[PDB]
Write an enzyme that holds these catalytic residues in place. Sequence first.
Site, mmCIF file in Angstrom:
data_model
loop_
_atom_site.group_PDB
_atom_site.id
_atom_site.type_symbol
_atom_site.label_atom_id
_atom_site.label_comp_id
_atom_site.label_asym_id
_atom_site.label_seq_id
_atom_site.Cartn_x
_atom_site.Cartn_y
_atom_site.Cartn_z
ATOM 1 N N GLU A 71 0.842 -1.190 0.000
ATOM 2 C CA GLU A 71 0.000 0.000 0.000
ATOM 3 C C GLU A 71 0.878 1.241 0.000
ATOM 4 O O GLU A 71 1.639 1.454 0.957
ATOM 5 C CB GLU A 71 -0.934 0.005 1.211
ATOM 6 C CG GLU A 71 -0.226 -0.020 2.554
ATOM 7 C CD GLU A 71 -1.193 -0.061 3.721
ATOM 8 O OE1 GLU A 71 -2.402 0.168 3.501
ATOM 9 O OE2 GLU A 71 -0.746 -0.320 4.859
ATOM 10 N N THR A 179 -6.194 -6.167 18.223
ATOM 11 C CA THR A 179 -7.030 -5.418 17.295
ATOM 12 C C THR A 179 -7.610 -6.285 16.186
ATOM 13 O O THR A 179 -8.832 -6.354 16.027
ATOM 14 C CB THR A 179 -6.221 -4.268 16.687
ATOM 15 O OG1 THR A 179 -5.247 -4.799 15.782
ATOM 16 C CG2 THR A 179 -5.509 -3.491 17.778
ATOM 17 N N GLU A 254 28.065 -14.157 17.161
ATOM 18 C CA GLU A 254 28.158 -14.806 18.469
ATOM 19 C C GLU A 254 26.838 -14.747 19.228
ATOM 20 O O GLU A 254 26.803 -14.405 20.407
ATOM 21 C CB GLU A 254 29.282 -14.179 19.283
ATOM 22 C CG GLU A 254 30.671 -14.439 18.723
ATOM 23 C CD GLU A 254 31.764 -13.786 19.546
ATOM 24 O OE1 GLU A 254 31.433 -13.026 20.481
ATOM 25 O OE2 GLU A 254 32.955 -14.031 19.259
HETATM 26 N N1 LIG Z 1 3.426 -1.732 18.088
HETATM 27 C C1 LIG Z 1 3.061 -1.477 16.837
HETATM 28 N N2 LIG Z 1 2.375 -2.424 16.108
HETATM 29 C C2 LIG Z 1 2.001 -2.166 14.836
HETATM 30 C C3 LIG Z 1 2.312 -0.948 14.257
HETATM 31 N N3 LIG Z 1 1.834 -0.947 12.998
HETATM 32 C C4 LIG Z 1 1.234 -2.134 12.764
HETATM 33 N N4 LIG Z 1 1.319 -2.897 13.897
HETATM 34 C C5 LIG Z 1 0.799 -4.263 14.040
HETATM 35 O O1 LIG Z 1 0.101 -4.612 12.862
HETATM 36 C C6 LIG Z 1 -1.075 -5.314 13.183
HETATM 37 C C7 LIG Z 1 -2.151 -5.064 12.138
HETATM 38 O O2 LIG Z 1 -1.600 -5.079 10.840
HETATM 39 P P1 LIG Z 1 -1.708 -3.774 9.905
HETATM 40 O O3 LIG Z 1 -2.090 -2.565 10.726
HETATM 41 O O4 LIG Z 1 -2.725 -4.030 8.821
HETATM 42 O O5 LIG Z 1 -0.242 -3.575 9.266
HETATM 43 P P2 LIG Z 1 0.413 -4.696 8.320
HETATM 44 O O6 LIG Z 1 0.961 -5.835 9.139
HETATM 45 O O7 LIG Z 1 1.495 -4.063 7.485
HETATM 46 O O8 LIG Z 1 -0.766 -5.200 7.351
HETATM 47 P P3 LIG Z 1 -1.225 -4.328 6.083
HETATM 48 O O9 LIG Z 1 -2.168 -3.244 6.532
HETATM 49 O O10 LIG Z 1 -1.930 -5.227 5.104
HETATM 50 O O11 LIG Z 1 -0.022 -3.696 5.435
HETATM 51 C C8 LIG Z 1 -1.494 -4.807 14.547
HETATM 52 O O12 LIG Z 1 -2.050 -5.852 15.308
HETATM 53 C C9 LIG Z 1 -0.206 -4.333 15.176
HETATM 54 O O13 LIG Z 1 0.215 -5.276 16.131
HETATM 55 C C10 LIG Z 1 3.001 0.005 14.981
HETATM 56 O O14 LIG Z 1 3.274 1.089 14.473
HETATM 57 N N5 LIG Z 1 3.375 -0.263 16.275
HETATM 58 MG MG LIG Z 2 -0.824 -2.113 5.992
#
Ligand SMILES: Nc1nc2c(ncn2[C@@H]2O[C@H](COP(=O)(O)OP(=O)(O)OP(=O)(O)O)[C@@H](O)[C@H]2O)c(=O)[nH]1
Ligand SMILES: [Mg+2]
Lengths: 439, 53, 103, 430, 430
Positions: A71, A179, A254
């Site tokens: 994206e 989420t 290591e």
């Molecule tokens: N802690 C943390 N987790 C993140 C962050 N961005 C995404 N996540 C994790 O990503 C999960 C959801 O996936 P997405 O928000 O869709 O992001 P993605 O893994 O790249 O998936 P896509 O949206 O398809 O690109 C959440 O449950 C978060 O745990 C971040 O900035 N900080």
């Molecule tokens: Mg994404």
Amino acid sequence: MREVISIHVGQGGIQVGNACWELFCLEHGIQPDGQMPSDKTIGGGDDAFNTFFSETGAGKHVPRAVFLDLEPTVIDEVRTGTYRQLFHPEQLISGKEDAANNFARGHYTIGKEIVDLCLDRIRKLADNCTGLQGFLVFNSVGGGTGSGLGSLLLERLSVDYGKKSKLGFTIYPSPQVSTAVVEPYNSILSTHSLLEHTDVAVMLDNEAIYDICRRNLDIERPTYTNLNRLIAQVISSLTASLRFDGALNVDITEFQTNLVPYPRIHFMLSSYAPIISAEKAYHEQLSVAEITNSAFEPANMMAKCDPRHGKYMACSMMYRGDVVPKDVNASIATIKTKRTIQFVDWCPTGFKVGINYQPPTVVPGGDLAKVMRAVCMISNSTAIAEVFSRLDHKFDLMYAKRAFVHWYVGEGMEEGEFSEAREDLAALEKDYEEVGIET
Amino acid sequence: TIQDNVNKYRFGVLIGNFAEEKFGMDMAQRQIDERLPNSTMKDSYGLKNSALN
Amino acid sequence: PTIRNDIQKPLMKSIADPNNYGDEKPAVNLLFPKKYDYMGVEQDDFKIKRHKYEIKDIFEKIGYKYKIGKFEGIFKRAQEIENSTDNKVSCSSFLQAIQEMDH
Amino acid sequence: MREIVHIQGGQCGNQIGAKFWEVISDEHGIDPTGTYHGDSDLQLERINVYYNEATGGRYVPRAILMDLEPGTMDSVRAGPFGQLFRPDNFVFGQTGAGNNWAKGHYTEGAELIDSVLDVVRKEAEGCDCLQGFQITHSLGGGTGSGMGTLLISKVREEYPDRIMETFSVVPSPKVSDTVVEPYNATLSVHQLVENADECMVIDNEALYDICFRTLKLTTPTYGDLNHLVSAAMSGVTCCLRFPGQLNSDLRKLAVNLIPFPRLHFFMIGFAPLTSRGSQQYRALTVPELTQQMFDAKNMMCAADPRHGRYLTASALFRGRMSTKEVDEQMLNVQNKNSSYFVEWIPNNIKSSICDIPPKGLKMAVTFVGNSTAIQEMFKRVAEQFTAMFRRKAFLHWYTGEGMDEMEFTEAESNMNDLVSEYQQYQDATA
Amino acid sequence: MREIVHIQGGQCGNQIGAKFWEVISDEHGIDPTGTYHGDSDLQLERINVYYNEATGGRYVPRAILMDLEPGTMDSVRAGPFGQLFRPDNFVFGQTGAGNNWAKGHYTEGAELIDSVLDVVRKEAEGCDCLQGFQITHSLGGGTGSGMGTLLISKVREEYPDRIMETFSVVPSPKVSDTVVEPYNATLSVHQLVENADECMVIDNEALYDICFRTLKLTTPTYGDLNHLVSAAMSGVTCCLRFPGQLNSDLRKLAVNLIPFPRLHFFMIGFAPLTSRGSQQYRALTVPELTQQMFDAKNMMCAADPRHGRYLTASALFRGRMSTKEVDEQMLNVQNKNSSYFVEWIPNNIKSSICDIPPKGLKMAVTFVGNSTAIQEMFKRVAEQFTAMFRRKAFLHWYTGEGMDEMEFTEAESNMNDLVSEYQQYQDATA
Ligand SMILES: Nc1nc2c(ncn2[C@@H]2O[C@H](COP(=O)(O)OP(=O)(O)OP(=O)(O)O)[C@@H](O)[C@H]2O)c(=O)[nH]1
Ligand SMILES: [Mg+2]
Ligand SMILES: Nc1nc2c(ncn2[C@@H]2O[C@H](COP(=O)(O)OP(=O)(O)O)[C@@H](O)[C@H]2O)c(=O)[nH]1
Ligand SMILES: Nc1nc2c(ncn2[C@@H]2O[C@H](COP(=O)(O)OP(=O)(O)O)[C@@H](O)[C@H]2O)c(=O)[nH]1
């Protein structure tokens, strides 16, 4: 001459990737303009920027990074962000459609139309590097793009390069503060891809950071900026030894020979300390005495798994600041004296020690102020079995009668594959139970 | 809701809701601050907290 | 008001006067008099500068005498520390210059 | 990139679409007189999602306008902000539907739908990478139920990959506008379930109930009702126009909300909403918005969730916010009301955040509901249909235009089948 | 080495504590910012008895401030010298004990007390070798007694060999500040006498008389009152943090001042005291210092010092001054007060010489002795106790949190027996 190529894929990694570089940028004095004026230093100093930056011949430094996501939303903000002039203009791979949190889409149909560029970029990237020590990859497991493209990318490397060690930092779903609704599916199938393909895994669950942020930073409304800051510290925390002078330098090579007794047991959890804000710090003492003691506090761990629920299998620590090494031994000895923290029977020596002088750098405007000491604790313990179990419990209920299955089935992935996942994930668990038994 | 209102009247007679229409009787001429904030990513990792200061 | 700070007080106390004009010292100050309060001089006396013709006379009386030229030089550096337009020097201000001086 | 399309048909479709286009023009910075007067550079960053470019920097909306009666096209065109629409996008006949489904899908539509398909195909192929279609229509009316649905089948058959959106204002037994409302609507559900991937019903009677109680306005009119819906579907497509902490697209919404292909019916809502009396007396934080979001009367459909249990529900927040509060509030509502959420699926709530809220508010929330309460809505219409059909009242019009009672009986059977298959999970246990 | 921590509970302890802490620092020149500015080595030779270090080289005092309400601390830190204390030690409740012994001792005090004990336990262990604690509180405060006693109790139950010191204010009936003072004052005596190793009582009433008369100031304030007390404490430990001719740690003072086990109640006074009007006449000498010590206006307790006999007395001479006349004066003092000195225990005078006098003066003297005169105070407070109980007035509150009248009966008889036992030696003869 000692360099490491960084791989970032997926939304979860990109921002954490965003955080790591800035501090990396700060620590060398390379301002976002792409220059390192320093104290008018031109050739009158060591060459330490190799570890994370490369010389272009005259002027600027080009980070050794490749960015992946389907994206363009996330890439655009970075491309027009505050560091627009640093990254290579074309190495910022941008996709066309979102992975929509489906593994099948991110691993068999849309993820196969972008890998070609990724490998081409990496192969050329390795060409410039001369002392390649390994790979560091940041990715998310709860997303179709994350697990999918990341898994495929890692697999491709496994055959292309092979013996080159790999260290990856993933982000599993929180035990209860979660989420996504289909995140567990992507995670398990992601585990299969990285179970036998990655070398060292560092659990970096999100919920743990919140409590660490709230309880110690005393912040009740943290944002994604705060959490990213902590991760960048550890990432800078683990590799900072290779690039600065230290009493006992420790190379990324290591870790596989000092933290993973068996080939399949290679999942490990992290923790950080000390953690103090910019208000209540100068009136506290911060000695090697208690800083090490706090690092083993269960509530302070960087993952939501109680170390009190399993024996300790192997540990590794790195010290920084003005720590006198003998102070290192004293802290360790009492820890063994304490009976709460217990090790397994088959590990006589379970403490790896390393000391690097440089003090952790502070990025103004943050939460962590300038302290003169700190310690990074990275340990592999049999207690991590629970987290894999808890995900398994979630899978069984939501897979008993084909929940959201048709979404994954239609993309091409075979139905019987899930049976493959359950077999591997549970097989690892049963592997861990045997390891903890006493002789 | 579904039942009619017997009293219509003009305004000024505090019969029925009367008060509710008054509240906002100025809000029709009450202004609203326009413009769009500056995002989240652009907020934290700004030109500050970098090698420029 | 609680404390009569706007009545101008009587120049002679009546030994039985029950009102306070604000000149009395609260107990926080009373327990710790400013060192030299026991011999009739208050510490706000070295902060009033005096002229060299009288500053010196104060200094030969003590027993500390310096020859002309060296006296003038030490005085000037005392003023240089003072950094004040007026030629008068802070007597104690000369007390710090001596310590750094004499070597 | 990830651009979409809009097709509005019938009087209600035209009204809702005009309101939505007005709102979108407001949000992006488009003026009737089309030139750009927006301030923030963020707005023009991705303006291509809902707009093309034309000679002279005049933006045009990729809408499609169609109907079988002339007034609706003439009325929207005359009014302000109807001058943005492409006249070439105008297609229509001169007969009228007259509240007859068969008049809308067999006799007249076939002669005029040929032109419409060409326009939609050309416009869609023009853009680079489609993302889906969102269609506005009505099931209780004449034109909307038939002409749009026929368009739906053809478009879906032609393009089997991209997802579709639909906005249907189903009738309710409280307020009625047609004496034959059950038929054309009931037959509508029969054909739409097999093709329309996502459907988010909208109920008028809830509009008056929400209009009278929370807003408390003395005299509301059609402009008031149409305005709200524009907000909901403008917010549903917010992350796809603006950056955010966790972008969530249309495909993401469907994947996290539809467990099985036959259960793809949703209900929506909007917040925050405040009566004119107490506007300035309340704050803007995650607590208040989350409390109002799940309220029974804050929804946008006649179904009352408290008699049913949610399966999957997603929240698309807007504007800045503290994420930990977002997560904490969602769990709290989940835990304190376990009885209302089915058990065999853990973590049945989704979240998302965007960096830009609507002009004039610090933040807002758009909610999509997928709960068993939607069973009642279909049940009541089914009750009316059987009574109207037993005596075959009004049946001669539809029997005299090529339709067969076999199709009516098939549709009536299908509705009951979906009702049963959808209510099963309420009592089904792991 | 052999240092101590300093702990506060209740409203009173807080106000007195701030004065004493500000008293100690300026003596060594510890500026508010925590950067040393003293001059002499002795100002840094033994900074360990009351201070620790951290990163940055600044000094912090190992004091853990406790209170059950926020108001006092929000101001005390808001006042001068609110920057030296570690905020990590700030732990406090939210409701307030309401001056009720029942509330702050069994119902609410028990819950919050866990935190302080953990911090109190944490602080003590860190030292190289600990000696004892000092606690400041008043029996007239419900919140003060509740938390204070348990902290007094549990700590001793945790460390048996250390020296526990408390300076409580017994409310004489002349200056009454609350209706329920008679109750809470008595009960706190029940537990404290049993466990508190040493007790040094001070009367607010007696404080006034000294301030009005000796200081001859028209209007004194709480700053004047508590500031006086701060001096005595410094003279209490003055022999512990500086070189002296006759060093005497807190334990040593314990040996010479408690002839019998339960008789562990003390009264002290600080001299010299002069008035700004009388500042520049008096002749500061051992001759003058002694005479003030044995006057009835030297001693901060209401009970008349010539209304009994003195069990034992000691004074830690402050400043440099030979002892020859000190001892001869001591025997001089003893003989010409022999009629008041108990006959069966000869040699009941103690002398210790510390070369470090309070800043701003030449010589300093403090008084610490055990006299039968303390009997009246318990009588006056005890007498008030009987009257209240007869009608059970205001007893209902205590019953409302688990208390029972049996315990109230037990406490008083224990108190009364103490008075009888103490006056038992009053008439004893050899
Ligand atoms: N802690 C943390 N987790 C993140 C962050 N961005 C995404 N996540 C994790 O990503 C999960 C959801 O996936 P997405 O928000 O869709 O992001 P993605 O893994 O790249 O998936 P896509 O949206 O398809 O690109 C959440 O449950 C978060 O745990 C971040 O900035 N900080
Ligand atoms: Mg994404
Ligand atoms: N909420 C709302 N509903 C409307 C509005 N206008 C019409 N409707 C509904 O649309 C239905 C009529 O459908 P109709 O336009 O005649 O369908 P058509 O004959 O195929 O064009 C009525 O039952 C109304 O309830 C409007 O402005 N707002
Ligand atoms: N010397 C002195 N005594 C005080 C002060 N404040 C209160 N007291 C005494 O404390 C007694 C009442 O205590 P109380 O207010 O109930 O304490 P609290 O419950 O902790 O607030 C009164 O008899 C006062 O004499 C003070 O600032 N200085």
